Symmetry: C3
Subunit: 492 residues, 3 copies
């Protein structure tokens, strides 16, 4: 009789982690750090709503396609939401030069303010009310973009146009003008009368003439002609002058860039519900508490970092279930490691929070420190490209997948590598706890091989805990012990 056993915690936990060498091992304490859920809505970002283009495209909005809403309030936005194939773009066919680059400039701007530079009624020298077309219905009557004017000959004449705008604001200004390409030569004179025309624009930074390419093309929303648009940022103090003898499509309104910052053009077929998140994906929002998610690679806001995994669980606790050789003590709470009182007066299971506090520490200090090392992890950024930019487009994707594949690898093999060390730690602690016991009770005790000690003396409860504190003095029971040792020697 009279013993002591060194064991470890074990409990109702059934969550199970993986490591490099073994897989799905059951553990007691562990933390999942993958987010895999989303609410499937489109929401404001930390209070500020997205600009939702609805069925319109960025171009249809900026030009004022009769079908597209204007934002008369001049709001700021957390991000912009375009559908994947918007219905309302260039109602009048044509192309929009360096369009993809303009959108990119949107991504770093948060608030426009539409302002009027060339009032539609100030074109005393031409017809400003004819330039409309069936290709651009509004309320089922022919019409036209609202923010640029399709100036037409007046009383069979088209006086060469020179008009300037001196940008006297603090902000940069986005301005869009355009030029008309007719079907045939008859139509050219029919609208503008000068056989040969041009549209030239001048700033400090930007010199460009433009001339109408007359060619027969197929009908598109009613129209074999096309109209080509251009744009520039006119810096504060600079001015812009338009020269034309025809085909000029004049800006009425400019766009004041009043707040630049972080935004994006998110492509999603969702529409806004009354809902605010920290982190938004084109398929829903994200409850950004975990450090990792696998929901979508284009997320914006205060987001966890995206990895291509289906599982990511940190191990922090123990493996699940007399003597540590034979498994764990379900009968332990109030600690991770410890002992067992089998005494003249005893009954077991007091912990060694000496070493459990020192281990609950460096475990939670290691897992924090793990989230933190991917602070700088690759987040992906939206960009678009045209049908003659395929090479670059694929470049970009290889870059974004390239970094995701990398960080996903980092993410995994960090978890499993430290998982193995977390568990190698417990095995170490247990056998260490053992030793501080063994190396103080030395001649007075039997190494029962299970991981327990039988006493050649009597310990008692105050000397019992005197093994916890490393207190035990070999001498105070030395001579008592040496007697019974040499009885079992030559006894029984």
């Amino acid at each position: 009789g009279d013993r002591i056993c060194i064991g470890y915690h074990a409990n109702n936990s059934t969550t199970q982690v993986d490591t490099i060498m073994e897989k799905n091992v059951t553990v007691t304490h562990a933390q999942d750090i993958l987010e895999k859920e989303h609410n499937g809505r489109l929401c404001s970002l930390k209070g500020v709503k997205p600009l939702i283009l609805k069925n319109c495209s960025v171009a249809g909005w900026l030009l004022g396609n009769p079908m597209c809403d204007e934002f008369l309030n001049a709001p700021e936005w957390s991000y912009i939401v375009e559908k994947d194939r918007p219905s309302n773009g260039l109602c009048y066919p044509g192309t929009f030069n360096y369009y993809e680059e303009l959108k990119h400039l949107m991504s770093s701007t948060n608030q426009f303010e539409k302002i009027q530079i060339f009032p539609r009624s100030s074109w005393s020298n031409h017809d400003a009310s004819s330039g409309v077309s069936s290709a651009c219905p509004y309320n089922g009557r022919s019409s036209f973009f609202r923010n640029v004017v399709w100036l037409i000959k007046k009383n069979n004449v088209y006086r060469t146009i020179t008009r300037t705008y001196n940008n006297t604001n603090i902000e940069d200004l986005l301005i869009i003008w355009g030029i008309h390409h007719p079907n045939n030569a008859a139509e050219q004179i029919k609208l503008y009368q000068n056989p040969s025309t041009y549209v030239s624009v001048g700033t400090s930074t930007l010199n460009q003439r433009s001339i109408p390419e007359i060619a027969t093309r197929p009908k598109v929303n009613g129209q074999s002609s096309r109209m080509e648009f251009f744009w520039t940022i006119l810096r504060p103090n600079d001015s812009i002058t338009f020269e034309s003898t025809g085909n000029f499509i004049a800006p009425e309104y400019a766009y004041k860039i009043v707040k630049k910052g972080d935004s994006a053009i998110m492509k999603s077929e969702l529409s806004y519900s009354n809902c605010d998140t920290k982190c938004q994906t084109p398929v829903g929002a994200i409850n950004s508490s975990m450090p990792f998610h696998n929901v979508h690679p284009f997320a914006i806001g205060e987001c966890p970092k995206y990895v291509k995994l289906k599982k990511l669980v940190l191990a922090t606790g123990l493996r699940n279930i007399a003597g540590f050789i034979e498994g764990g003590w379900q009968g332990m709470v109030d600690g991770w490691y410890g002992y067992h009182h089998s005494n003249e007066q005893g009954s077991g299971y007091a912990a060694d929070k000496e070493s459990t506090q020192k281990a609950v520490d460096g475990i939670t200090n290691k897992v924090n420190s793990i989230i933190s090392k991917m602070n700088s992890q690759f987040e992906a950024v939206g960009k678009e490209f045209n049908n003659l930019e395929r090479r670059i487009e694929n470049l970009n994707k290889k870059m974004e997948d390239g970094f995701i594949d990398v960080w996903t690898y980092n993410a995994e093999l960090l978890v499993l590598m430290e998982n193995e060390r977390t568990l190698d730690l417990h095995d170490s602690n247990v056998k260490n706890l053992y030793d501080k016991v063994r190396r103080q009770l030395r001649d007075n005790a039997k190494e029962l091989g299970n991981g327990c000690f039988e006493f050649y003396h009597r310990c008692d409860n105050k000397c019992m805990e005197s093994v916890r504190n490393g207190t035990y003095d070999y001498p105070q029971y030395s001579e008592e012990s040496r007697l019974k040792r040499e009885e079992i020697d030559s006894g029984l």
Copy 2:
């Protein structure tokens, strides 16, 4: 007399791995996972042959340079093979607009079918048989591209051309046309007679006029004039119309994109031998059994992942060579760890496949699991760029080297890091095996310090293996043992 010794395997192996801390350490069992060989041929990919352009370039092929083969069979291809500096490109000098982007579109397409849109004999209004040139010999007589027609004035007139093609197929169609730039004004009238000409093309997505730039340049394959080509993809249901009053170079044949998928334009001076691989490099094929190779960074097919190393060896077995303290037991087969019978009846070397099966397991389960984590590793993709695209070209290469340098680093430091843990495992197993022995034979045995036990009792062969199974009961020999212990005490 009467003993037992705990030892580990050791054998004729001489393959040697590295780790972080020590280098070239000799081991017993290990697996090389670098491929470094190649057969130096160009082969089909899993049954399907490459399109081999021979001395021709992608342009010379697509336009039908008289020197280039046509593919009348309409085959599909695993990949396309261009030489590095092909001899047959634009036989007639000029430039090929957005050529580099066209090639990129090749890389994602597997099978053309040439079809005739504008039959050469249907140009009743012009001379279709004169447009040939010494710059384009076929059989040593002047000639010209085969898939586009160099329409010339007929009987000193050049009626303005309008011709359309409505694309009624399911597939996209690649079409190439072109415009002629003459030496001087005399030549312009000499061939097309209208002093001022244009070439305009119209689709839904594409509006472009083109006008001849008349300038004296140096002779190139006979010709100071140049000819500029263009191309577009005409989508199903769309149509295309060409307008010209001169210099038009008309398509005869279009190209039906009938199979898109994974392919590439591989630059190699090899030519095809009768040979099929899974993985092909521009210097030869690859016996894709290893997870890594260092042969070439542009490989295509079911390929191992390329790393810039010269060695990559996993350690899975032991280090090479009474008692484990002093090295390994060459005299062990049928296991990795185990013992030795030195008995009244004994002779040594029965294994502990208890722990060897449990370790041959997690070793082969770890090495599989290592190949798998680079499942998502960066493979590089061919792209070309023109002399005004250098920035992007270098961008791309920095990206591709950037990811290769990364994954090569991952690859190495995965091997060495787990190599060190594989070997730390064996040391652990050996000393653990020891303990399950020691902790059952306790008072009845002498800890000879070599890693062996001498018996204060007698064991015998059935109790012998009774240490393997953890079977041994201390009591059944306890009193027998305690006698001889206290004889060596106060004996001899």
Copy 3:
């Protein structure tokens, strides 16, 4: 009496490293490998000075803006130094086509030699001395770019120009020409008299007409007109021909690319001091002895690798402070591990350089081997982009930050991971050293639990070191020992 104790080194060191699990742990021996200092000057690279543009831009230099220095010596350069917003660029306003790509070509070229192709006095057919302007003062009188000529009508006529240059040199040649865009039609005739003009250039590789876009723009350094420049590399054996009837701005001097290699255009507001480094950043030079620095991401030369850290310390030695259980022996020099002579004749502290030499080895062999694995680490490369290239610009930066964030992560978690293994090694060594002692002195000694042994016999100094060498024979003192053991048994 009569004992022996196994302990480890401990000393005045106070440098402290981190690992994954614990942080700032004090150690004895360690090596910092982060560089964080710089001298704040601009210096030659290994003997060869930078080309310092001063207040001029690459364009103002190459064109010979009257304000910019010429380099009459034809020097080679280690790298080029542009200020961030240079004062002297196009003194005459306009734009410089594919400028950003030209600069990139600078980065891979080390030495020009200006040579004269079209001598300014050889324009017998036009006015070569009028083409000057207030926009380009030199000594406060109107003037003009020095390396191109603003040819003007002579005696009210402008004979169509045809001039050629056959490039008969071995080197490539950079040539720049230009075309003038006037305010209005009156000015066009005023200078060149032909109402309609062109500027066409012909090489093997390059065919381009150019025509003056006449439009009113705002005054810039005096001038509402603009002038547009172009450039090409004319390969050896090729020729170039310029055709014009007006607005031609003719090259006088070409640039011989005579040494290509590694250089760069470094943007810095510093100016050169008399100073040479191996590694230069736009904020100063770098004492490139460490493997890592955090000074600046664009460094050039024989540079350490840049990481975004503030600390990077390798641990190689021990943790700081009878028996190893209780800390380290300040009283040890001449080794890392070892013992202590407490003997009939003894006094302690002789080392076990058996195992210290074997550990000082694999520690310095591991730290070298760590610097080496980032041999291939991502270094960043300068590139510039125009206001319509934003997408690509941001692509590039995401790429360069993307790889830096990665390698910074690698760098850190390599240090901390091996730091933990370096320290796990010492704990291992110490307890191992212990064992080679314990397993030879076995029955003759008391395992005092502190990590020391008391002798049931007497050892003496020659048997003392006989524990170092593993020499000790159990038998020579066995019978002497067994006597006193069985006295403490049944004694006192």
